[PDB]
Structures are given as structure tokens and as C-alpha cells.
């Protein structure tokens, strides 16, 4: 690796992850699942109904969007995400045991995961999480692969998976 590689993981950080993995879009959109989506990877509702949307955008923003938002509101929305998913981990008595065995890179991919699935979503995956607790990293990937999260929309969940296995940022290279 050269000087500049070495400077690569002081550059990416949880935000630099999930904007990768969720992408950044200004006008309200339908993720993989079909759901209404905005900014970094904000799901607004599973509703099929663009009206709750867009309810939901300005309730979430604080004023009339008309489906529509700025990079810094996409930012402050995000943060609040992420702060989120943080804090949905450290409260729960199953996924902070596992978040505090984990090394730095890997929390990101948890706070990742818990930010794409919500808790009892993440918390249910009890062979993983068993997995990762113990540094069966190759296993805990495979387990990773076969669910519905990651087989459902592969591209938003695959660096994850990876990043599960190495504890590296390798996945966020070369884009």
C-alpha cells in the first residue's frame, strides 16, 4: 500500500459508508423494495401512496417540500439516521454485547445494517450474531448471504457483507 492507501480508512467513516451503500437523492424515489425513499437511503414509508410520502418528507424536514430537498437537509436528516441506528444498538441487551466485541470497521458495518434493516430486524439474526461474537467471520458472511435483506437487493448490502468478513474498507475502494 502505498502513502495515499494508507490515508484511505482515515477517510471513510460510517456517513462515507451509507452514502455509498444508499446513494444521494434529492427528489423522493422508490428504493429496491419499491418504497418511497429520499436523500441517504431515508425511507419515508412502505405505503405505496406518494401523498403519505411526501406527508411524512415535510413532517421529517420541517416545511413544504413538495417532494423535493437540499444536499444539506439530505445531510441533517442523515445524521439524525445515523444517530439513530447508534443508539437503537447501544440501548438493546442482544446487539450491544456484539457491537462492543467488534472492531472499529466492523461496528460501521453494524451501524449499517441496523440503519438498512431497524433493530428487531437485526437482532434476529441470531446465528450471526453468535457468529460475529465470536470472530467466525467467513461463517457470519455466508449467513449474511442467505437472507432476504441482501438477496432482495444485492448491490445495497454487499459491501456490508464483505466488510463483515475482512474488517477492512477494501469494499469502498475504487468505485
Given at each position: 500500500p502505498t502513502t495515499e492507501n494508507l490515508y484511505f480508512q482515515g477517510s471513510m467513516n460510517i456517513f462515507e459508508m451509507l452514502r455509498i451503500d444508499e446513494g444521494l437523492r434529492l427528489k423522493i424515489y422508490k428504493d429496491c423494495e419499491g418504497y418511497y425513499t429520499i436523500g441517504i437511503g431515508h425511507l419515508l414509508t412502505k405505503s405505496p401512496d406518494?401523498?403519505?410520502?411526501?406527508?411524512?418528507?415535510?413532517?421529517?424536514?420541517?416545511?413544504?417540500?413538495?417532494?423535493?430537498?437540499?444536499?444539506?437537509?439530505?445531510?441533517?436528516?442523515?445524521?439524525?439516521?445515523?444517530?439513530?441506528?447508534?443508539?437503537?444498538?447501544?440501548?438493546?441487551?442482544?446487539?450491544?454485547?456484539?457491537?462492543?466485541?467488534?472492531?472499529?470497521v466492523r461496528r460501521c458495518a453494524a451501524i449499517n445494517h441496523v440503519f438498512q434493516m431497524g433493530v428487531t430486524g437485526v437482532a434476529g439474526f441470531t446465528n450471526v450474531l453468535r457468529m460475529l461474537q465470536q470472530k467466525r467471520?467467513?461463517?457470519?458472511?455466508?449467513?449474511?448471504?442467505?437472507?432476504?435483506?441482501?438477496?432482495?437487493?444485492?448491490?445495497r448490502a454487499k459491501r456490508v457483507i464483505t466488510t463483515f468478513r475482512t474488517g477492512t474498507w477494501d469494499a469502498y475502494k475504487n468505485l
Open positions: 406518494l401523498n403519505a410520502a411526501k406527508s411524512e418528507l415535510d413532517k421529517a424536514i420541517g416545511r413544504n417540500c413538495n417532494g423535493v430537498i437540499t444536499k444539506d437537509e439530505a445531510e441533517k436528516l442523515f445524521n439524525q439516521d445515523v444517530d439513530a441506528a447508534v443508539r437503537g444498538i447501544l440501548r438493546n441487551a442482544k446487539l450491544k454485547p456484539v457491537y462492543d466485541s467488534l472492531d472499529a467471520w467467513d461463517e457470519a458472511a455466508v449467513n449474511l448471504a442467505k437472507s432476504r435483506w441482501y438477496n432482495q437487493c444485492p448491490d
